[PDB]
Amino acid sequence: EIRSQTIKFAAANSKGHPQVTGMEKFAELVKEKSGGQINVKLFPGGVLGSDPQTLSGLQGGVVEMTVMNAGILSSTVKAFEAVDLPFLFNSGEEADKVMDGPFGTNLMKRLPDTGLIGLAYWELGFRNLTNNRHPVAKLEDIAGLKIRTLQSPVPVALFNALGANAVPLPYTELYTALETGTVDGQENPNANIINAKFYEVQKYLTLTRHQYNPQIVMISKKFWDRLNDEEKAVIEQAAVEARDYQRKVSREQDATALDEIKKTGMQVTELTPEETTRLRDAVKPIIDKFTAEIGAETVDELFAELKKVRGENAENLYFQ
């Protein structure tokens, strides 16, 4: 039977953010399905530590649950670097198909040996590109731009392949570096433009969608192994039901963010799928260098899923 359980569920963001809205839905569903036997206590705002710190806390059994960008796992299970590869998805719908299918599922199968159990993928969002020099609509427009990027190997390779300087800078210093102009631009989700007021110091946004950040919801294997099947089923049901809700909330908020961004007088540029393909093809010979460490098994499967979803895109039937 479902016994009294307590689950501490930690994350980086705060109440109001789609991540925490998803966590609240998860907690409520678990409370309902368990008739109050399983209580999920939220630790938002990074109060328990960074995402990498909390990851090791799950492994040790100190914190039961967390949700974080799945690419963070790569130093635990290298195959997860696949989720950081560029230009995989053009929409949330495409991302869901691939993350919820064999690609995402086979990644999660690699977790138990490391002391982690994967429950579901939720959404953080696409990474896009702002700058203050000129609109970016194609590769040549990126040439020479000094762009603050994440500093793990994939984004550094990506932005160098695009002709940019992939500049290291602590996030807290970024607004002011953009203001003074020593950095031309930055790459991040749209929400950051509003939250950090980058619209005050950046005139241009391109929806490059150069990477997509899925989040993975995980539970400590040490804790999971002590649960019975009925308790596990409650948690699984709640994770996948909360997933669909969280993604809807995320996408509603992103639409509103973009409304707000446009009203600040930033110029927003979209890429056609064919321009995205042009960028993808230009960076492929560089990005292929990660395939050996990710593994052909994982990369080949991913590439097949992407060919499939790209063929389902209605744009293929727009003109002929």
Let me know: does 16 contact 49? Beta carbons within 8 Å.
no
Q: Which among 6, 12, 8 has a CA at the least distance from the CA of 47? A: 12
d(CA 148, CA 122): 26
Let me know: does 208 contact 271? Beta carbons within 8 Å.
yes
d(CA 179, CA 312): 42
Q: Which among 152, 41, 66, 162 has a CA at the least distance from the CA of 116? A: 66
Four-point Cα dihedral 92, 95, 100, 104, nearest 10: -150
| Separation in Å, CA 237 to CA 26, 150, 245 | 9, 34, 13
Let me know: does 69 contact 215? Beta carbons within 8 Å.
yes
Q: Dig out the tokens for 227 from the structure.
A: 């649960």
Let me know: does 153 contact 225? Beta carbons within 8 Å.
no
d(CA 215, CA 124): 6
Structural domains in the chain, sorted by start: 1-320 (3.40.190.170)
d(CA 162, CA 183): 16
Let me know: does 313 contact 97? Beta carbons within 8 Å.
no
Which spans in the chain are helix H? 18-33, 51-60, 92-100, 102-108, 139-142, 153-161, 174-180, 190-195, 221-224, 229-263, 273-287, 291-294, 296-311
